[model samples]
Target: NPSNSNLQALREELCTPGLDQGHLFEGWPETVDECNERQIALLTDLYMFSNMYPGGVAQYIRNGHELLARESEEVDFAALEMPPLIFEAPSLHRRTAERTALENAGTAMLCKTVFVLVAGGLGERLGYSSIKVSLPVETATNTTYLAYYLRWAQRVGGKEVPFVIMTSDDTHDRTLQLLRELQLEVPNLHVLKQGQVFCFADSAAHLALDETGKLLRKPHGHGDVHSLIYNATVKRDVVPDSGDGTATAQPLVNDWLAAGYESIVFIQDTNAGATITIPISLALSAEHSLDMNFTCIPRVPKEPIGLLCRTKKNSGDPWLVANVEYNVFAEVSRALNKDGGDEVSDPTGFSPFPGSVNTLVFKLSSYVDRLRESHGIVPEFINPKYSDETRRSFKKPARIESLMQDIALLFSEDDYRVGGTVFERFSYQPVKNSLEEAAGLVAQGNGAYCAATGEAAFYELQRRRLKAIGLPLFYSSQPEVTVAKDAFGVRLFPIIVLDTVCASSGSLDDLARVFPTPEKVHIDQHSTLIVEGRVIIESLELYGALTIRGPTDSMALPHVVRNAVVRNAGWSVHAILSLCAGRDSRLSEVDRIRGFVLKKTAMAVMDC
Candidate 1:
């Protein structure tokens, strides 16, 4: 359907003299049959050589129509359906600053999974010579990002969770070699070539039109790297083919998890620019659950962003799309913010799902089979626009291809499903393009990315669910404290409030005026309070000598042994007061209190 007037414009653009980095794309197949073979051939071609762009379609789908036609034979989607948000109450949740209970669970050992996302394209900004993943970052412990990841994999958690890095033809060797040199021990490590159409590094050498010899933009975007997700190593159970797993100087592709693994976590490499992810995020899959579970943060109105929304498929039930069609996002965004016109609609509190932040979490409980059936319908891929100048092509490939996108189609087709929970957490800071932007973001204190208030939110959320399920209530050690001294005995329950630390001395007079009480009032330690009894501050700093009582417990002063020690405040009064009431031994408390004060100059200041 070429238009007569637009023919010349098309020719000029097509013959633009720069290398077509969108390699492997034979013009769009006109019919369904041709498209089938195209898709099959794409994957077949990639099995042998993986130099194509990350998302190079030509490499992944060579057999065309036949490729997807047979996918269901290998995939099992029904088990893939995850359960909805049915909160189950746990018997007990012991909260300690030491480690998350989830971190130490038996499932943690059995369900160990590594995160591997191939992101090797050169960042356009910052004028760097290679992909931004190659950028150097220093940690407080004097380790670089790349090194830290390997060390983290081995040191913190055993290599039970290894990382698989998918690289493009350009950075393939360098990336692999660097990892090998580190010789980091892990249960498994993989570095395979990311399928791609063109290498950005080769552009400068390519001659320009008229033989003028100018360097051009030949690099395929990062999305182009998704094809390697199905490389030979990943597809067939062929491990020994490339020698002893290190044939490529990297782990052989044969051991690839394209078949089965407990879970898969995808994260942008630049995340090292902020913080090291310790406990991986709990990922969401739409087996039976809605895609809304994945939105973590809001989007800026005009950015070219893909959204997870319910797609009303022409043939089946609605599924969520990772990247929606064209300016539909703009239109949708506009509608949502419109003046009560009710332009768009979704579940309450949902926005174009907060981006996956280039990070994906896949609990591969039934993955191998899921991949086989995943080829159901190749989606009506759309490259939508935000601003007139910027477009987001849903067709762009990455190792996972918005694992959610493919899953969305499966859900829509009613092919298969999983029913469980995948929660999306908020907070993401990506270092894209310019080094300046990265630097600026860091300078502005945006570099730290983590649960703003740590596990408190999840704990509270879990607590409510537990209560709902008829489970007993649980509390973190930080919350349980007892206070006694002078004339009053008090109990304090601690609560974590976003970014503030709140403490209270319960007493009729100590209560803040804001809230009157038949209620026991809580005031900060500095406020006057009357109390009696030996009170444990619930402070960890006193751990070292917690059992010893020096003379008057009050004089002995309260101190908890914590990783970072802090000696006494109100609890100190309770201890000293206790010792004084006891006898001659109580006098020792007074001497000990004086000694403790002389011992901690900093504590003296804080106490004052």
Candidate 2:
């Protein structure tokens, strides 16, 4: 292998003075079973890293460490102001007109837009050993994160909106295996690996090592999404080579711009209900002339997420946004702590600038145009990370990516304005850790656990999911539901029903079949409800202002809600469910329902 010219040349390049760090090899294993295979792979990665970063990884890491130590106090938060929130109200009429005009203009923009899903993290926090996208968050449908997106893409974009998923080395293979098993037939689907960086141990900064003495590596944050976006392989299907064959290829960003993609919509992997809603894509298109636009939601208490803010330097500018994590200055860091900060003096009070939900739309041409200006270079940030689980820590120097909302700063207001719109709180459901699973379960209709906090959160999530599925809300007591207006005169129920199909039969008539119209249950004679899914009313008695949704054709069986109450309505339930009750059966909670199937046959219940 050493005699091979390419390997020899690669080794020489790695050993170049500025490229190689001698200390990393100090603990190299004396005995190796893999021989040149392991060395060759490591050296190849080193060569690529060195070529991209000419100053060497050693210097990059050193500079990152120094930057954090020296520049911790550079930003003055007291002088900073939060960006103005773009809430819907007096502007609602105008915003609606804009969305209708844009989408009515043509589906061409929607067809040309590309969807980038960032699924680079594992589900360690949620107890799933596999990729995060495979975690089964929804109990009723028994769906995973990946299936939700695939289903949405299939329904909305079909083959038009090319899906580009960015996965990390840890998740890449498993994600592919799961995707194949699901057998989703999305057209022009592409997966790109998020690049990794070596983990450093401490200030003394020896490379963090695994048991094998090889350096430990971690993902370079979601910011690496930009790396994949502008990458060469991403645009192969859309971009073709010049006829002469001698002409050089342009960056895929440029090619995509030329290929007629007007915008790029990026969604985080954990989000279950990503769709081309009015406020998100439509607003971006409404302001189609701007370089970028983003969607945000109302901030909740102690919510450890990014907020929208304007930069301290430019007051005249349209508001700039950044992830609270990206600005880890002394004042910002102190303010982030829930334990010490003055609860009342906080400028925005409980909420900061409207919380960012990380959904964004970027003008395709503007993105490429800016890249050309800088020769495809973006600013980099030095991020320090440490782990208490072990001695491993890291000082990673990589591109500084603005949380999608923060991307506003990259554009100049004079030539290009950055705009943002606010979505209702329910529209911004993100499952970061496991504690939210109970809330998620309730939100997904797998349970009846509704606290004041839990119910509000669940409604927001429910509103978004229903929107994603293209079902309009027929009625809600709350006036805040976007994309659908409250159907007045309908008795309000604490139920979520969307995607049900019925012909000629009105919403109340459909509800009467699935739900017991208790004599006490009041209703407006003119109230109309839409049915799209199957709903079995367990107790019409406990239901005060009850809400029931129609079942879609896909939901053909009864599933149990875990650790939650299902009020018993007895054998009459059998009559209501007779429409689809006796077919092939799959149930997760058997105890929730008993002795209610066909004669001599019991429904098969699978435990979740």
Candidate 3:
């Protein structure tokens, strides 16, 4: 194989320089079995690492060492000072005309938007086998993340929005299969698979370890999403199709811009509250003409969340508004003389810097052009697990990586292009914790981003929306109940799911269109209610489950529910469901995740 021209050329290109300090690779294996396929794979990764940084991987390591040696005391940092665009639910609900104007403005801009979902994730840590996007945001409708997000965009645009999903290797195919099986048929949809990078061991650019000390690779970071977004090519079904129904090819961003797409709204995969704030976030970006806008909330001092901070040199240097990580935020603040970065100085009793939820929006016109200039390359950071604070030796391997949110650094010029909208009623709950971790979060009085907390929060937010409209609703004072012994002993939620047609915008007033007479409706802890279509509620009472599907029939009597009374036994703790009944016993994956078997004690269905 070495006799071939291309193979010979590869060998020449890979014959790069060695590390200046070879002793740093002392922990590496002294010898290798030539017959081992994995050893050969390690050689391949070495070649890749060498070629990636053509100045030699040793120089890359040297750069990392230099950057690590910098003292935080010499740098200047300041908390973000730009007053964010504000949108609180209670205030928006009070000012109907003011809220509707923004809604209309948001809707107009949404038609020219391209929605990107960063869905490259799994739910295994959450103890589910499927991708996180396939997990239920709420159990009443069992709405998966992908299904909910798709419906959310469709509702705002009144037409097909160019929806894109970014996937990693583990989730790419499963996400594809999820779409194939679901009833949600998305249009203008494209999927981009993110790539990975080689890991470095010690200061020397050696490959990572395996059970047998061979190579091990992993994803670089979500920052690959920007690189993929900037470089994706696709088939044009809507444009330049062949006469025989074949499709031609074009670049994704160019095609979108030509079609009048203005913004790229990036959202995290497991967020259940995107349906509420995304349109408003989009409006803030266009109205302010911002190159980058972060959707943020107030942070508790010393709580584990990133802070959107503006930092600059005291000598009138260019200002940088960016999200700083929790680990370095205090140091950055101390350097700026910002009171140790731990004081609750604001009247809101939170940190002056707002917390980031990893949800942000940026203009396509600005960043896409910027992306083409840099070939989507981002500034990298290296944090070596050092032997001590001496910073002279590493304890183990380290890799240079980038963060997706760090894209805001591109707007570091004095133009003030980066900003955020801080909304306290942002209504965000991510299913990021295991059943065990959520227990600790609750004990610490912090946000519990687990299954129980996510569903309960979504239901409660819906109730809050209704309460803001002065509707008569009551919370059940039922005690917490455990279904299966494995099930978390959490109280049942008053489940509520909005239809695609309900809540035309993120505003609560738009919900009035669906519930013109919602006073008769009452949701208790035992109740489950979902609106699947547009239907006015003339009168209703529910203590059980009800689904009203619509697109009202023409010959029907106005598709109104008048004096309808319904009550039944809903979901309850049946028994302890054993996941291991025997070798032959097989329960549903849903049951395994929820730690309960789903079965209705009784039910009644009436089609209207």
lDDT of 2 by residue, 489-576 (tens): 1111233423323211112223334434234332221222222345443232221122234434433553222222223221111211
Cα lDDT tens digits for candidate 1, 1-608: 32323333332333344323233334744332444553444334332233332233233222222322332132211111112332211212223322233334312432455556555665544444555454433111123346645544443334455566766666777676666676655556667554333112211112111123221213334443233444433312243333444335322222544424455555556554112122313322322232222322344333334544434423344543333422555543443232333234445534433433444444454443444454222332212112323222212221112233344344332533322222223333343433234334435544322111112232243233223323233333342212222221122212211100111111111112112221222223221121122222222232111122112223344332123242343222222333345454533322221111111111211220
For each candidate, the alpha-carbon lDDT, in order, equals 0.34, 0.48, 0.65
Please report how far candidate 3 places residue 408 from its true position, in Å. 0.8
Q: Which of 2 and 3 is the better model by TM-score?
A: 3
Tens digits of per-residue lDDT for model 3 on 1-608?
22234333333343445434333234434333322454345455554555444344445545555544443134444334543433332233343665566666777787787888988766587778888999887666677888888877876664467888989888999999988888667767888887555456655555456576654455656677777877787665665442443354467888888777888888889887765666677776767777787878788766667888766535456677778887676655554343434433788667777788888788888878778877777767666677877655657666666678888877655554778877654466777876666666666776657776676677777777777676667776453445334334555446666666645554655667667777766666676666655566767777787776665332234356778777888655433344476466555565555444334564444455
Point out where model 2 deviates above 4 Å: 1-21, 27-45, 51-59, 70-79, 84-109, 234-251, 276-281, 284-289, 313-321, 326-330, 333-349, 373-378, 382-408, 436-608
- Of 1 and 2, the candidate ahead on lDDT is 2
For all predicted structures, in order, the TM-scores are 0.45, 0.63, 0.82
Q: Comparing candidate 1 with candidate 3, which one achieves the higher TM-score?
A: 3
Off by over 4 Å in 3: 1-96, 212-214, 240-249, 313-316, 330-348, 384-396, 477-479, 482-491, 501-509, 520-525, 551-558, 573-599
Stretches of candidate 1 exceeding 4 Å from the true structure: 1-111, 127-130, 136-139, 155-157, 160-162, 180-183, 198-226, 234-260, 272-295, 298-305, 313-317, 321-328, 335-352, 373-413, 416-426, 433-608
What's the lDDT for residue 371 in model 1?
49
